[PDB]
Design a protein around this motif. Structure first.
Motif, PDB file in Angstrom:
ATOM      1  N   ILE A  88       0.763  -1.480   0.172  1.00  0.00           N
ATOM      2  CA  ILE A  88      -0.097  -0.162   0.072  1.00  0.00           C
ATOM      3  C   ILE A  88       0.494   1.691   0.591  1.00  0.00           C
ATOM      4  N   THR A  89       2.248   1.039   0.197  1.00  0.00           N
ATOM      5  CA  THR A  89       3.188   2.587   0.474  1.00  0.00           C
ATOM      6  C   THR A  89       2.532   3.481  -0.765  1.00  0.00           C
ATOM      7  N   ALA A  90       3.062   3.280  -2.568  1.00  0.00           N
ATOM      8  CA  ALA A  90       2.507   3.696  -2.934  1.00  0.00           C
ATOM      9  C   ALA A  90       1.138   4.553  -2.302  1.00  0.00           C
ATOM     10  N   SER A  91      -0.278   3.895  -2.896  1.00  0.00           N
ATOM     11  CA  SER A  91      -1.224   4.945  -2.059  1.00  0.00           C
ATOM     12  C   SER A  91      -1.380   5.592  -1.374  1.00  0.00           C
ATOM     13  N   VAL A  92      -0.318   5.353  -0.102  1.00  0.00           N
ATOM     14  CA  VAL A  92      -0.549   6.126   1.508  1.00  0.00           C
ATOM     15  C   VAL A  92      -0.245   7.077   1.478  1.00  0.00           C
ATOM     16  N   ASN A  93       1.199   7.292   0.918  1.00  0.00           N
ATOM     17  CA  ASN A  93       1.867   8.151   0.181  1.00  0.00           C
ATOM     18  C   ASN A  93       1.568   9.306  -0.031  1.00  0.00           C
ATOM     19  N   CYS A  94       0.180   8.691  -1.608  1.00  0.00           N
ATOM     20  CA  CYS A  94      -0.142   9.546  -2.583  1.00  0.00           C
ATOM     21  C   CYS A  94      -1.342  10.240  -2.041  1.00  0.00           C
ATOM     22  N   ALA A  95      -2.125   9.787  -1.172  1.00  0.00           N
ATOM     23  CA  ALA A  95      -3.467  10.162   0.004  1.00  0.00           C
ATOM     24  C   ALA A  95      -2.664  12.026   1.080  1.00  0.00           C
ATOM     25  N   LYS A  96      -1.795  10.822   1.670  1.00  0.00           N
ATOM     26  CA  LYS A  96      -1.385  11.771   2.287  1.00  0.00           C
ATOM     27  C   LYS A  96      -1.295  13.148   2.034  1.00  0.00           C
ATOM     28  N   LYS A  97      -0.255  13.181   0.171  1.00  0.00           N
ATOM     29  CA  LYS A  97      -0.215  14.513  -0.789  1.00  0.00           C
ATOM     30  C   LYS A  97      -1.807  15.231  -0.225  1.00  0.00           C
ATOM     31  N   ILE A  98      -3.309  14.215  -0.725  1.00  0.00           N
ATOM     32  CA  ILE A  98      -4.301  14.462  -1.276  1.00  0.00           C
ATOM     33  C   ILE A  98      -5.116  15.096   0.207  1.00  0.00           C
ATOM     34  N   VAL A  99      -4.474  14.423   1.293  1.00  0.00           N
ATOM     35  CA  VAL A  99      -5.717  15.339   2.199  1.00  0.00           C
ATOM     36  C   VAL A  99      -4.920  16.384   2.857  1.00  0.00           C
ATOM     37  N   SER A 100      -3.850  16.749   2.775  1.00  0.00           N
ATOM     38  CA  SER A 100      -2.770  18.029   2.360  1.00  0.00           C
ATOM     39  C   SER A 100      -3.340  19.647   1.226  1.00  0.00           C
ATOM     40  N   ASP A 101      -3.694  19.188   0.657  1.00  0.00           N
ATOM     41  CA  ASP A 101      -4.644  20.271  -0.186  1.00  0.00           C
ATOM     42  C   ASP A 101      -5.283  21.272  -0.245  1.00  0.00           C
ATOM     43  N   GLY A 102      -5.934  20.504   1.186  1.00  0.00           N
ATOM     44  CA  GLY A 102      -6.845  22.123   1.659  1.00  0.00           C
ATOM     45  C   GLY A 102      -8.084  21.061   1.828  1.00  0.00           C
ATOM     46  N   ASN A 103      -9.185  20.707   1.324  1.00  0.00           N
ATOM     47  CA  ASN A 103     -10.768  19.699   1.743  1.00  0.00           C
ATOM     48  C   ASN A 103      -9.761  18.769   2.442  1.00  0.00           C
ATOM     49  N   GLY A 104      -8.952  18.611   3.104  1.00  0.00           N
ATOM     50  CA  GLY A 104      -8.955  17.461   3.668  1.00  0.00           C
ATOM     51  C   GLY A 104      -9.724  15.946   3.125  1.00  0.00           C
ATOM     52  N   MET A 105     -10.703  15.199   3.903  1.00  0.00           N
ATOM     53  CA  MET A 105     -10.552  13.721   3.442  1.00  0.00           C
ATOM     54  C   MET A 105     -12.108  14.120   2.813  1.00  0.00           C
ATOM     55  N   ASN A 106     -12.448  15.034   2.958  1.00  0.00           N
ATOM     56  CA  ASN A 106     -13.265  15.363   2.042  1.00  0.00           C
ATOM     57  C   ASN A 106     -13.660  15.072   0.512  1.00  0.00           C
ATOM     58  N   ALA A 107     -12.222  15.038   0.092  1.00  0.00           N
ATOM     59  CA  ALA A 107     -11.743  14.748  -1.585  1.00  0.00           C
ATOM     60  C   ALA A 107     -12.438  13.299  -1.814  1.00  0.00           C
ATOM     61  N   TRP A 108     -12.493  12.466  -0.667  1.00  0.00           N
ATOM     62  CA  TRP A 108     -13.052  10.859  -0.934  1.00  0.00           C
ATOM     63  C   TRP A 108     -14.461  11.044  -0.780  1.00  0.00           C
ATOM     64  N   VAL A 109     -15.036  11.310  -1.725  1.00  0.00           N
ATOM     65  CA  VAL A 109     -16.647  11.017  -1.880  1.00  0.00           C
ATOM     66  C   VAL A 109     -17.393  10.710  -1.060  1.00  0.00           C
ATOM     67  N   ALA A 110     -17.078   8.762  -1.417  1.00  0.00           N
ATOM     68  CA  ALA A 110     -17.675   8.147  -0.206  1.00  0.00           C
ATOM     69  C   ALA A 110     -17.509   8.469   1.371  1.00  0.00           C
ATOM     70  N   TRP A 111     -15.651   8.480   1.771  1.00  0.00           N
ATOM     71  CA  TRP A 111     -16.236   9.777   3.231  1.00  0.00           C
ATOM     72  C   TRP A 111     -17.115  10.262   3.555  1.00  0.00           C
ATOM     73  N   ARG A 112     -16.884  11.243   3.036  1.00  0.00           N
ATOM     74  CA  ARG A 112     -17.798  12.040   3.342  1.00  0.00           C
ATOM     75  C   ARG A 112     -19.477  11.743   3.240  1.00  0.00           C
ATOM     76  N   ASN A 113     -19.797  10.621   1.982  1.00  0.00           N
ATOM     77  CA  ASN A 113     -21.118   9.814   2.870  1.00  0.00           C
ATOM     78  C   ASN A 113     -21.538   9.093   3.236  1.00  0.00           C
ATOM     79  N   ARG A 114     -20.493   8.620   4.226  1.00  0.00           N
ATOM     80  CA  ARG A 114     -20.990   7.017   4.300  1.00  0.00           C
ATOM     81  C   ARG A 114     -19.392   6.964   5.845  1.00  0.00           C
ATOM     82  N   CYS A 115     -18.673   7.909   5.971  1.00  0.00           N
ATOM     83  CA  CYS A 115     -17.783   8.024   7.053  1.00  0.00           C
ATOM     84  C   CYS A 115     -18.132   9.445   8.324  1.00  0.00           C
ATOM     85  N   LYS A 116     -18.398  10.202   7.473  1.00  0.00           N
ATOM     86  CA  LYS A 116     -18.101  11.891   7.938  1.00  0.00           C
ATOM     87  C   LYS A 116     -19.257  11.527   9.272  1.00  0.00           C
TER      88      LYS A 116
END
Ligand code: NA
Length: 129
Positions: A88-116
């Motif tokens: 999972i290394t490349a997935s995790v290191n890319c996701a760290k970039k994404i969650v850093s981008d400004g919208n946090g975990m809202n980038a993952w629509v299913a997180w926002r709709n099913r986990c938040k």
């Protein structure tokens, strides 16, 4: 590879995700469940022509190169195939970039709709962590 729930939690913890940018580990496990079913090889094509890849359904328009997404960026500086591996290394290191981008975990629509807003520590309950 299809991960078990606690197996993925442990792997996520080992890569430094528990409390990364303030998101407790259960948030990441929850997002993985609903994005991919814990299946590293998951791919889904979008209407715009981009594809989402791997356990965290990382998108070709901005984060990885797949050669078929016009005008797209590769902000993780990886082939999107790197995101389907059992490691999972490349997935995790890319996701760290994404969650850093400004919208946090809202980038993952299913997180926002099913986990938040839900009891996400349930995702890690029982696990040896
Ligand atoms: Na791209």
């Amino acid at each position: 590879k299809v991960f078990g729930r606690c197996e993925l939690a442990a792997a996520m913890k080992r890569h430094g995700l528990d409390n990364y940018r303030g998101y407790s580990l259960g948030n990441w496990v929850c997002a993985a469940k609903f994005e991919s079913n814990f299946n590293t090889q998951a791919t889904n094509r979008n209407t715009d022509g981009s594809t989402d890849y791997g356990i965290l359904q990382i998108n070709s328009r901005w984060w990885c190169n797949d050669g078929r997404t016009p005008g797209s960026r590769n902000l993780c500086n990886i082939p999107c195939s790197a995101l389907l591996s059992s490691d999972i290394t490349a997935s995790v290191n890319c996701a760290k970039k994404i969650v850093s981008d400004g919208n946090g975990m809202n980038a993952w629509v299913a997180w926002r709709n099913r986990c938040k807003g839900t009891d996400v520590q349930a995702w890690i309950r029982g696990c040896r962590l």
